[PDB]
């Protein structure tokens, strides 16, 4: 039969990046935020004019990784460090980043995409990404 | 800004698998050595089957056609005809490195939503299209 | 050899964000499913918004148009017309893998300096250009 | 003179991926399985609609690696860990993955391709890949 | 589903080596600076020899021709002629990034099975084809 | 098989530097915003200078022209003219991803040996060629 | 309103690479020096005819990395080694190099690009890059 | 003035690969040997029909690395291991491999290219590469 599941909308992606960039302004950070769809393809990007261009790749990779692994990128890093996850996870996919700041996006229990932030270093990247995610509480 | 949760059909792995299986059966019965590729709605592979006597280029050909049909929401043969009749600019060829405007890609539609694409390469022209259409039949 | 420090306008993240927001609003009001991309003057993305019903190719299409307009300092539609009228050699198509000579990219200018480019894909031809122009209006 | 060797057929590749996806259903995992030919080029791929897109790369890389190295990817990982294999093996080829789940395919003592599975983590990836391989017992 | 074990000829490293050696000898005797490339049936290199006075582009040219001939199972010159006479759509050019539809690639056949391809670049047109054919002679 | 040691001229870093310096001086005096690129005989960069008002595409344009001229051992403008007059097949465009058959690349020759290539982009057509030629003058 | 900031000029990039190559001559090293703009795109490259072609990539990556991270590449290496920076910083961007020899270029307190040197190994690469940077004192 | 230096000829590259493949036959190994020019661009490749396709990349990367670094790839590996070479050398260039089997080619004291072998594992790769190099004694 035909399976129906939530799909992450352009409007939802836009709302997330807008909130993240507002918070990044407030905290004085120069970042990029990226939201990807279920299959890792971009729905939204916003970059600050003082954010280095690496933050485009950092944020995309984190979003992609979280969307595909269905776990926060920080958790994967923690898992390699404590020996529970093989370190070769790093090389599984050229779009992988295990730096903190990627979070999976779930709607009605289905993974529908990912959000990633780069430019503020790990802790703040994670804090900002979470603020984006929380726009979609349901 | 965010709006409501939107739910849409999803092309399942089982559906993609059934499509490639029926296409390969028809290709063998018809005398063609092909690759058939099914992609999701974002152009990412769900299924590939290649005949060992199909050239490796058919991996690229079938993928590109499937990608193109999914993204353009049109059959690749229709785009080819639009380029020829001047209704579509020829520079469409260079818009995306995964584009192929050769016959054999068809969008996959469930409940009026484009959920993916199917592409076939190796059967030359019209037979790639016929084979791709065979794949769609398994969803009916 | 080095000369003096030169200061020029910078397209801000806020400006790029405002541009993509207004373009997406207009696209939805107009009946188009698009991606809009804004790049800095070196062709590196500042902002992207994509409609979930816009094909993934529109990511590439909009980026390429934005890149092309920023680098060439001309609207992509003007380049397309120059190729057609013979004033621009067709091999311009192959000069850079990020080039698209299809309508919908426009340079972004502040205080007479090209500071970036905007590109739109998914609305077919003239509407991509109209939408890109809407983005420029937010800077005025 | 002219050397003749087995060649992995499309039918064989198809049979392997079908069995793997059946078993993955039964075990409740969302994976991709990929089979490659002797020269690392795809013959078959099947992905579950809940499997992240990284599993395309993971499964391909594992299949490619096993086909070219003529050993299971898990064995290479084990060998780096115990110091018998130099760690720079990781960077020899951009298609390499030393994550468990790639197995070489042998017919009549000749390496004819590789099978790889990604999406279930190492142990289950290996279990699933083996089920695929066993279709070709002779 | 799996069927029987199928055995086919394999182009050996010794055969590929002999082919490139004879082609380079003929090229030097003929006044050409070339690269000759032999690929296996999946388009992966078995042998390359380049003259130090052959431009590096001849690495790409010879590889692409060898790949194309192996995958298409036809001489690249035959494909070029089909594009010109309208029997082959020109978009074949974009189906695979390793395609070259310029003369100089020929499929390698052993016991009626395509086992690889040979390509030559640097001798311009018909001489690339003649040189590629010289390589085939060593298998007889 | 190996033969004798062969010695040939080498384009030095100092020579490549002098070439790009003189080209940039002439470009500024002439009213052009360009990139000039010099490559070694294997197509690998020795020198690049870009004007901050030259679009980033000129990095690719100048490199491709320099590469093409070094590898083909001909001026890119001569290749462009050969395509137009039918003496060179148009598929030369797809032989190598670093090819540009637009005017502005010239081979660099020392003691009758091609030792590299120079390419210029950003000055449109004939001025790219004139600027590239200025670079050659510093070797005399 | 409209923000105005310094932009690294072609003339400035040229002056930097000329000075670096003069010093490299004097010290007997075969290097490449690369200068990139604010967004990591090349403004200048000079390579010695005895410098290996890897120095093109080395110098570019170092320049890019320094421009985007706003810190010297040597500092990032030091930070991974002492545990203050997560090692996965290495994989954030395919243009990253944490080898010594990249330095950010600042004009009037704004990061406007990066300079990188490769071919002399770390210490000398750093020394040469600094000589380039010092051309722009203000 | 005009500098003249040796250039590695096609004939020299051919002679090297022929000797290596003869020795590989004799030793029962399935390898690829690659010779690159001064700027890392291929002059010769020979692969055995039982050598995995990764050996194309392995041999090229080793040849490229040795040509550009002007030292054997085994030496670089040794140097990272003993702490004399920073480990980030691995990421300087996408064509780098620090696996044993790459050797620089020198003519009249000038580095003119590199030879690399892959498929026999490190020690034998190095032994085979050396046999190739020795064709050019002068």
TrEMBL record, chains A, D, G, H:
Keyword Metal-binding on entry: no
Keyword Repressor among UniProt keywords: no
Keyword vocabulary terms for this entry: Signal
Name of protein: GlcG protein
Lineage of the organism: Bacteria, Pseudomonadati, Thermodesulfobacteriota, Desulfovibrionia, Desulfovibrionales
Residues of the full protein shown: 32 to 169 of 169
């Amino acid at each position: 039969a035909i399976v129906r599941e939530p799909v992450l909308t352009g409007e939802q992606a836009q709302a997330m990046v807008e909130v993240v960039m507002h918070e990044a302004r407030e905290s004085g950070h120069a970042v990029t935020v990226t939201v990807v769809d279920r299959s890792g393809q971009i729905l939204a990007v916003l970059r600050d004019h003082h954010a280095g261009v690496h933050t485009l790749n950092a944020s995309y990779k984190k979003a992609y990784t979280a969307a595909s692994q269905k776990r926060e990128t920080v958790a994967i890093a923690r898992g390699i460090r404590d020996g529970s996850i093989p370190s070769d996870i790093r090389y599984l996919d050229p779009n992988f980043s295990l730096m903190e700041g990627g979070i999976p996006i779930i709607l009605e229990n289905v993974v529908v995409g990912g959000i990633g932030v780069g430019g503020a270093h790990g802790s703040e990247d994670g804090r900002l990404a979470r603020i984006g995610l929380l726009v979609l509480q349901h």
